[PDB]
Design a protein around this ligand. Structure first.
Ligand SMILES: *CC(=O)NCC1CCN(C(=O)C2(Oc3ccc(Cl)cc3)CCNCC2)CC1
Ligand SMILES: *CC(=O)NCC1CCN(C(=O)C2(Oc3ccc(Cl)cc3)CCNCC2)CC1
Ligand SMILES: [Mg+2]
Ligand SMILES: [Mg+2]
Ligand SMILES: [Mg+2]
Ligand SMILES: [Mg+2]
Ligand SMILES: [Mg+2]
Ligand SMILES: [Mg+2]
Lengths: 5, 236, 236, 5
């Protein structure tokens, strides 16, 4: 899963 | 409602304690109470709000994915019929997740966004709005899925427009917004090319502005730039 | 109450799903519902019950320790007065923890223990009873602290007496009971010598019985023996 | 903290 902030 | 009798400052203090104790549900409830006092939030307070709900919904999303995977496996050929329980429990978790998203969106709509005039606050809240519609989109399968997706897109787009006019390309809020909108494009909108272009352009424009920064600002910006690079590596 | 309309088998199925999703509060609620059906629990079901509540209370204990440490620091010389919030929030967490302990003890008393006739089931439940009184003892500071400590001791002692008569020295339930009772002695009863003696004797008696076991039983027993050794190393 | 099961 990709990085989010 | 339940936090109506507690001082704003006490709610904020307790949110910080809850964070230290990794009690994120409590932290979110305290921050909800603080928002409902009706005063604007400072930067630190906005961060507490976002951390609390990110952690709560993050846990729900991870659980939902485990359960959805089990459910998908149950519908494959040669899988034994186990009854309604997997669907029921995935639905239970899903409903709880949607409830949390609705709570956050409610706080943003009543009345955080409309009172947020400074670019840094308005962009931060609009990013949140995009994020919580994105989480609703992840589990949406019905008549309103398109409208939910568009609600996320619209919030992110407004945030992007403000951020590009009002903030430097290294600003951590601008960077984090772009990171998340890029993920929206890749994972929700079936637009991997847009996702990749956004991440690349954001990274390169930030790179070119690093020279203007202090050591501490450089640290903050480069951390998020690395996340953009990580996603680009995953996708290319 | 809330689980009264759900089939026993569905509650058990959902507890297993909740475990896979790391949804331990849900898992505990499902298992509470299953116990309240009034039928005895199988070994697998007893394990589900214990895992669920161990994880829930484990999280509460970790949070309580973080908060108690902050509170203790606040009462040192030269510490600035920050008001009632740290004590209030530690009390909130404490009350929730006590509630969970009371819930488990209630299930054991109504009516798991009294219906448990086989050594393996009775010892398992009595160990649980000792464990949840031990958790109550960890946070007790008042008139009933001694009685709470004695309630833990009594439950553990009954479990020990049965385990020594009815189970081999390598039995994982006998081993786990001894491990936990040893910790009770060290951490609650201010009896480190008793703790050390119990851990050592339990380890050595198990060592001498390993020759009787299959590969798989050997794996199970030696895992818990290593925990006894770990504690002995911590304490000596 | 010591090990329990
Ligand atoms: C009030 C305010 O200006 N908040 C922005 C902070 C910027 C630094 N920061 C971070 O870098 C981390 O979290 C973010 C970053 C960007 C956004 Cl939009 C949201 C959260 C980066 C990821 N780990 C946590 C800190 C905190 C917020
Ligand atoms: C129904 C029953 O007989 N349960 C006992 C199992 C023995 C194996 N086992 C374990 O070894 C672990 O957990 C325990 C062990 C002993 C007790 Cl009394 C309770 C739990 C060891 C620690 N990690 C989890 C498995 C499971 C219970
Ligand atoms: Mg006031
Ligand atoms: Mg649904
Ligand atoms: Mg564009
Ligand atoms: Mg029935
Ligand atoms: Mg108290
Ligand atoms: Mg003895």
């Amino acid at each position: 899963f990709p990085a989010t902030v | 409602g339940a936090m109506g009798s507690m001082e704003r400052a006490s709610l904020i203090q307790k949110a910080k304690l809850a964070e230290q104790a990794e009690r994120y549900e409590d932290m979110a409830a305290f921050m909800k109470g603080a928002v409902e006092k009706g005063e604007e939030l400072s930067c630190e307070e906005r961060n507490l709000l976002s951390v609390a709900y990110k952690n709560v919904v993050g846990g729900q999303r991870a659980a939902w994915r485990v359960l959805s995977s089990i459910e998908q496996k149950s519908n494959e050929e040669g899988s034994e019929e186990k009854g309604p329980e997997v669907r029921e429990y995935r639905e239970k978790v899903e409903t709880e997740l949607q409830g949390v998203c609705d709570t956050v969106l409610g706080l943003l709509d009543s009345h955080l966004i409309k009172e947020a005039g400074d670019a840094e606050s308005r962009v931060f809240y609009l990013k949140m709005k995009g994020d919580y519609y994105r989480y609703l989109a992840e589990v949406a399968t019905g008549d309103d899925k398109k409208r939910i997706i568009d609600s996320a897109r619209s919030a992110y787009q407004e945030a992007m427009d403000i951020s590009k006019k009002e903030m430097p390309p290294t600003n951590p809020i601008r960077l984090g917004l772009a990171l998340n909108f890029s993920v929206f494009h890749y994972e929700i909108a079936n637009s991997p090319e847009e996702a990749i272009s956004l991440a690349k352009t954001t990274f390169d424009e930030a790179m070119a502005d690093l020279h203007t920064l202090s050591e501490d600002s450089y640290k903050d910006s480069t951390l998020i730039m690395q996340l953009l690079r990580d996603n680009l590596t995953l996708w290319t």
